[PDB]
Nucleic acid binder design. Structure first.
Lengths: 29, 70, 101, 101, 663, 132, 59, 185
RNA sequence: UGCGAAAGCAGUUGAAGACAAGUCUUGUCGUUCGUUAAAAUGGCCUCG
């Protein structure tokens, strides 16, 4: 269980450390 | 290496010296272990990008020469 | 320059004009008077690959000026024309194998 | 080893992002191919690590639009994961060896 | 909220700029002439004439043909004569153009090799033609417009003549493909007539051939400025024919050269995308006759084929163009320090695409090929290929869309379109009247009737000719110098009412049934857009200065125009790109849509607005409720499909590598 | 799931202290975690609150067996990193450091931990072999 | 249609051989006057090989 | 003169040039005579692009005055050198340095410009053709540059060895113009 | 910025003055007091 938790917390630490040719729209005026 | 040490663990204990006769094993092993801390950091960042993107005329052709000919 | 040892200096630097020159084999030394300051210093003249003449400072070796003629440069010579008391001008005379000077 | 040096040369010169700015998948795939192999080597693994981190940080958007770069990078996750295991058993062997003594 | 169809499946590529030429010799003391113009040569054979006044607006365009280009452009400006333009098409022909019609006024065979270069002498009565066979041909033009005669042949030599320059009317200076500059004597009454007095050789690349691309004469100090393939610029003494200074400056070919009026500045450009500035302003430099390389600037993404210079009391222009297909303008005096403008690649003064509200059809015609798309997501229902070499000038589609008319200067052809199997069946309707008819402009009155303006500006109605009377225009000195200003530029047909605008600012209302012409307006500026609104019974006219004028169709001007012409928003005035297209709003007739190359605007004409450098200063005369958006750009064409639907059509080469250092 | 998502949304708007209870609810599944973050976390304020609640809990007990609280932070970071660093709250930065420090220990702990797993997997097989 | 495209290519021939004497087709003189002077292909190609030269590093 | 920010004297020692805030203006004066007395704002020389860009582009790090007084070189933190003709205030841009240029000095005849900076490379600018000769891999960054001789036989150079942040380590080099070899370190 | 080991553990940023921009609101400082407190196309000789 400790191994799983520690590897997990490792992943979390590393996480913390880290045009179309045609488009279709409808504009307001 | 694991099975060699596992089965003959009792025999190895009753040996006058281990480090001198197994110096290469420790040195060789030690180098691999040093990879683990950094290498985990790479999987995280590697996993970060991995999750990010993973979740994220001839038929109508008309020609005048060709029509004129037939 | 001018006895235990010889004071010898080695001129190697053309300052970006290395292409025009392939050798120092043909050269001559002349006197150039800087009229703006009235100072006089030596100059080394060289023969270039294509009608080129390279002029170097005698002591500092700095590339001062260069002269170009049409055709293969065959020979050159220096003439001095006095102007006034203490004033003279140096003229470079260069010729092509055909005879244009 | 010659490959490792030049990469080791660029990093100490402080030129990593500089060398990776003007690149696309076509000229980026050769970079990763060695990285697919370098991660296995102990000596180059840490060096491989630095260069893969920057390119992912520098070319995240291109990776989404580039399919091939993904597959190059998918196999990296498998291999790098394998190296995690190999080191993990090593640490297991180290402690038990320490237990024997 | 209002629908937009942002479309980029329509693609137009401008031809690479090949030659540039200003119409007048620079005179710093004198004011800018009203007739100053710039001609631009294109790799597709099109010649574009632009006006440096009111920012830059394109007065007229000469349409090219298939497999055609312009490799050299040359003007002749004789006092009291119409402005004359001459072009070289890469063959053994010199073409003089009818500016009034835009057609080739005269075609003259040089009786020699393929033409590489063209130049005109100081007195402007002779042309020099550089040929592939190394022959230089001298052509007399003093006879008159359209008059071309063989004068004299300079000695034939074996090297291609890549460029030509003149020294007054006495000598011809030519750069050759053997890395060798040649000076010929053009002095008549001289035993050395046509004789090759001196001939200079540049430094030659060891492992490559050396080409002298450009040569320019410098009257003030009397030298020749030469650029070759090696990237070096050399300055030569004319009288002795000797090298004065050399600058190994460019890393690639130097293709073009130019100088200022006073010969204090020499400007070079080429493949390396940089423009180099050579200076001799300093008095000591002038006394010592020594040039100095002041600076360089990287402004183009690709090769700079053409460079030209102009100066006047109110003008100071350095205009550059090339493979990038765009114009870059800079100040000669402040090249190093002055601001620059990059002209848009496409400025749609002439509309090459149309949108049909009925059937939702988008039709584009490029290079004698017409493509039709349908929007419901877009399908190319039909594409049409035409045989004639001449490009399509204009295309008009009937309101129903069944009848499509394709117009060219040579001929006009009508093709009927029938929808079968989500595709359009094309059938060419035979009309002899239209086939032998030149079509500058063509609009539909209805599904059947059409109004056509000929290249000769003969307006008539064809039913699928009922000629329409046109008011005569008083001749002016500017009209004599520039013929096409008096020609019809914009025609518009709206509910039987036809409006025509000329480049001189004359606007007339035409009643098609009555076939009678009544004057409407006489504006001081070139007209860029015209629109007729039936609901308000007014005509909207936009000048080159982006002023909006609304005239009642019979007060001459509407009350809105009287109140809002000088009170336009800041955005309209600040625009350096002139308006080119106007279309109404279906939902509200009063509202009108106005768009340029890079902007779209809507103005409500029932509401009055709150009162609250690189172009000619324009000291001289030209002759003699609110929505604004720039988010869409560059804009090929804008219009409505339905009441709430907008169609916006937008535009979607290896180059010399110049690394950008980064730390 | 939908009910709890609405309850969590209401609590986020109401500044309720029961946000932690909503997050730890067992009805949540990983795809719903992605769906909620993408579609319901549209305001920077809500994003900060969820991060602050999760960070404080994990900081206090990084060794909790409940994988859910870590499960949230994974995609909250993965999917909203650009918005998270955009947050300029000083307290948010401090909690990140506190979380960064609380996590930081574990990575030091793991290399010692894995070897000691090895010693146990070792000691078993001899005991099994001795039994056999 | 590839078959017909060859037929059109066969159609556009201004030259055929009969007996011992070649024959060449004449286009109308008035048509040639109307057509523009056109370009030479070699002059453009000579430019093109120059525009694509190694020294330019166009790349 | 008041609020003098930067000052220099000609190689002969008879002309001074100095910059003041009376943003800034540069003025040159003859010392023993009244022949030279000129002044002009720095903005005139400064480019419009320089004005648009950061202050490093507008910040001057060095200046040299020619002996006769026609040419004045101004260096910039960006590494740009601009030689100004005082007769007509015409500007000429010489830029090879990538960092702030730390030393500028005109030749006795004025045909050459000596430049040095953070690059640790001495640059001899040949003005008639703007060519450049280089002396790289010096021991330290260049603080100062001077040509010392009736004929410019020797060059005096000043090195900082900036690596040592604790102390400023000045080293004085005298180089032979003939072969550009260390005559006295 | 302080202590400490490298790990880390604690804490820190304010008052003016002058100028530039918009048109009263913002920026900057070869200027003061106080607090432990990216980017002007610009790369490094010759001596074979």
């Amino acid at each position: 269980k400790q191994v799983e938790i520690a590897e997990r917390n490792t992943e979390l630490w590393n996480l913390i450390d880290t045009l179309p040719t045609y488009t279709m729209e409808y504009l307001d005026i | 290496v694991k099975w060699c040490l596992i089965i003959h663990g009792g025999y190895l204990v009753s040996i006058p010296n281990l480090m001198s006769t197994l110096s290469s094993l420790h040195s060789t092993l030690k180098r691999r272990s040093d990879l683990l801390p950094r290498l985990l950091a790479l999987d995280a960042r590697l996993d970060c990008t991995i999750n990010k993107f993973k979740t994220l005329e001839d038929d109508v052709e008309y020609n005048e020469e060709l029509d004129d000919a037939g | 320059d001018l006895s235990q040892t010889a004071k010898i200096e080695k001129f190697s630097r053309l300052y970006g004009h290395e292409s025009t020159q392939r050798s120092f084999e043909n050269f001559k030394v002349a006197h150039l008077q800087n009229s703006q300051t009235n100072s006089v210093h030596g100059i080394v003249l060289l023969q270039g690959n294509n009608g080129w003449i390279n002029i170097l400072h005698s002591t500092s070796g700095l590339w001062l000026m260069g002269c170009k003629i049409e055709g293969v440069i065959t020979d050159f010579c220096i003439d001095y024309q006095p102007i006034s008391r203490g004033k003279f001008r140096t003229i470079l005379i260069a010729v092509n194998a055909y005879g244009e000077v | 080893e010659l490959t490792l040096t030049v990469l080791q040369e660029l990093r100490k010169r402080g030129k990593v992002r500089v060398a990776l700015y003007g690149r696309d998948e076509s000229t980026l795939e050769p970079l990763l191919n060695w990285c697919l192999k370098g991660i296995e080597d102990v000596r180059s693994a840490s060096i491989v690590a630095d260069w893969v981190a920057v390119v992912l940080e520098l070319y995240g958007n291109t990776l989404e639009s580039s399919p091939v770069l993904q597959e190059l990078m998918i196999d990296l996750k498998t291999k790098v994961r394998h190296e995690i295991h190999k080191s993990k058993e090593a640490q297991r062997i180290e402690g038990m060896l320490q237990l024997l003594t | 909220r209002m629908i937009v169809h942002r479309c980029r499946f329509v693609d137009f590529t401008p031809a690479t700029i090949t030659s540039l030429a200003f119409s007048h010799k620079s005179n710093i003391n004198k004011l800018t002439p009203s007739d100053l113009r710039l001609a631009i040569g294109r790799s597709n054979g099109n010649i574009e004439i632009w006006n440096p006044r009111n920012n830059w607006f394109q007065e007229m365009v000469i349409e090219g043909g298939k497999d055609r280009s312009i490799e050299g452009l040359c003007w002749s400006n004789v006092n009291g004569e119409s402005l004359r333009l001459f072009s070289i098409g890469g063959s053994t022909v010199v073409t003089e153009w009818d500016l009034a019609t835009g057609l080739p006024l005269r075609n003259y065979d040089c009786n020699s090799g393929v033409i590489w270069s063209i130049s005109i002498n100081d007195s402007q009565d002779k042309l020099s033609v550089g040929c592939d066979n190394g022959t230089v041909v001298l052509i007399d033009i003093s006879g008159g417009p359209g008059v071309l005669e063989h004068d004299t042949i300079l000695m034939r030599q074996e090297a291609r003549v890549l460029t030509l320059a003149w020294k007054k009317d006495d000598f011809v200076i030519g750069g050759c493909s053997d890395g060798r500059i040649r000076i010929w004597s053009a002095q008549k009454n001289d035993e050395n007539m046509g004789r090759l007095l001196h001939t200079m050789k540049v430094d030659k690349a060891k492992k490559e051939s050396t080409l002298v691309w450009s040569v320019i004469y410098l009257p003030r100090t009397d030298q020749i400025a030469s650029g070759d393939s090696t990237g070096s610029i050399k300055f030569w003494d004319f009288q002795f024919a000797t090298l004065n200074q050399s600058f190994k400056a460019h890393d690639a070919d130097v293709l073009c050269l130019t100088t200022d009026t006073d010969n204090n500045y020499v400007f070079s450009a080429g493949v390396d995308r940089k423009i180099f500035q050579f200076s001799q302003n300093t008095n000591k430099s002038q006394k010592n006759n020594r040039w100095v390389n002041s600076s360089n600037r990287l402004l183009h993404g690709n090769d700079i084929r053409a460079i030209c210079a102009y100066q006047s009391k109110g003008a100071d222009f350095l205009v550059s163009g090339g493979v990038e297909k765009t114009l870059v303008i800079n100040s000669l005096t402040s090249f190093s320090n002055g601001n620059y403008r990059k002209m848009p690649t496409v400025e749609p003064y002439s509309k090459n695409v149309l949108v049909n509200k009925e059937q939702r059809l988008v039709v584009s015609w490029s290079e004698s090929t017409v493509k039709i798309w349908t929007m419901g997501n877009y399908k190319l229902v039909c594409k049409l290929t035409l045989k004639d070499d001449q490009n399509i000038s204009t295309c008009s589609l009937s309101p129903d869309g069944q009848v499509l008319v394709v117009g060219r200067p040579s001929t006009t052809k009508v093709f009927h379109l029938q929808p079968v199997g989500n595709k359009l069946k094309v059938t060419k309707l035979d009309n002899d009247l239209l086939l032998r008819t030149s079509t500058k402009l063509v609009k539909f009155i209805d599904n059947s009737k059409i109004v056509i303006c000929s290249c000769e500006d003969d307006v008539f109605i064809v039913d699928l000719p009922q000629e329409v009377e046109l008011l005569e225009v008083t001749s002016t000195k500017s009209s004599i110098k520039v013929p096409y200003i008096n020609r019809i530029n914009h025609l518009e047909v709206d509910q039987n009412i036809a409006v025509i605008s000329r480049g001189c600012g004359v606007v007339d209302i035409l009643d098609l049934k009555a076939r009678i012409s009544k004057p409407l307006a006489r504006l001081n500026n070139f007209i860029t857009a015209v629109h007729i609104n039936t609901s308000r019974k007014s005509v909207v006219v936009i000048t080159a200065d982006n002023k909006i004028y609304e005239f009642n169709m019979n007060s001459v001007l509407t009350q809105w125009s009287k109140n809002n012409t000088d009170n336009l928003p800041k955005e309209w005035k600040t625009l350096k790109e002139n308006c080119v297209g106007i279309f109404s709003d279906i939902e509200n007739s009063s509202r009108l849509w106005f768009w340029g190359a890079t902007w779209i605007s809507r103005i409500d004409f029932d509401v009055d607005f709150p009162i609250n450098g690189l172009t000619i200063t324009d000291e001289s005369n030209f002759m003699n409720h609110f929505f604004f958006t720039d988010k869409y750009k560059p804009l090929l064409f804008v219009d409505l499909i339905s009441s709430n639907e907008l169609a916006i059509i937008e535009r979607n080469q290896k180059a010399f590598i110049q690394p950008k250092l980064v730390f | 799931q939908v009910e709890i998502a609405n309850i969590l949304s209401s609590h986020l708007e109401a500044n309720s202290t029961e946000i932690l209870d909503d997050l730890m609810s067992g009805s949540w599944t990983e795809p719903e975690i992605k769906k909620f973050i993408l579609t319901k976390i549209n305001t920077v304020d809500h994003l900060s609150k969820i991060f602050l609640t999760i960070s404080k809990s994990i900081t206090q007990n990084p060794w909790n067996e409940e994988n859910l609280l870590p499960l949230w932070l994974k995609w909250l970071l993965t999917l909203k990193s650009g918005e998270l660093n955009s947050i300029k709250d000083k307290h948010t930065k401090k909690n990140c450091k506190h979380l960064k420090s609380a996590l930081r220990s574990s990575e030091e702990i793991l290399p010692v931990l894995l070897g000691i797993q090895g010693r146990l997997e070792m000691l078993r097989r001899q005991a099994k072999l001795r039994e056999d | 249609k590839t078959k017909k495209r060859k037929t059109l290519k066969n159609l556009r021939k201004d030259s055929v051989k009969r007996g011992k004497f070649r024959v060449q087709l004449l286009s109308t003189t008035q048509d040639s006057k109307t057509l523009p002077p056109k370009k030479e292909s070699s002059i453009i190609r000579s430019k093109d090989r120059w525009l694509n030269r190694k020294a330019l590093n166009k790349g | 003169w008041h609020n003098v920010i930067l000052s220099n004297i000609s190689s002969n020692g008879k002309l001074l040039a100095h910059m003041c805030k009376d943003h800034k203006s540069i003025s040159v004066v003859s010392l023993f005579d009244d022949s030279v007395n000129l002044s002009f704002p720095l903005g005139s020389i400064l480019s419009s692009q320089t004005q648009s860009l950061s202050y490093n582009t507008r910040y001057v790090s060095s200046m040299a005055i020619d002996n006769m007084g026609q040419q004045l070189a101004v260096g910039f933190a960006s590494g740009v050198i601009s030689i100004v003709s005082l007769a007509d205030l015409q500007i000429r841009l010489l830029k090879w340095h990538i960092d702030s240029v730390l030393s500028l000095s005109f030749s006795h005849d004025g045909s050459y410009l000596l430049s040095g900076g953070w690059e640790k490379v001495m640059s001899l600018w040949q003005l008639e053709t703007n060519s450049q000769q280089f002396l790289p891999r010096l021991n330290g960054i260049i603080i100062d540059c001077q040509v010392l001789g009736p004929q410019g036989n020797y060059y005096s150079l000043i090195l900082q060895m900036t690596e040592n942040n604790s102390n400023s380590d000045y080293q004085f080099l005298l180089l032979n113009a003939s072969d550009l070899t260390s005559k006295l370190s």
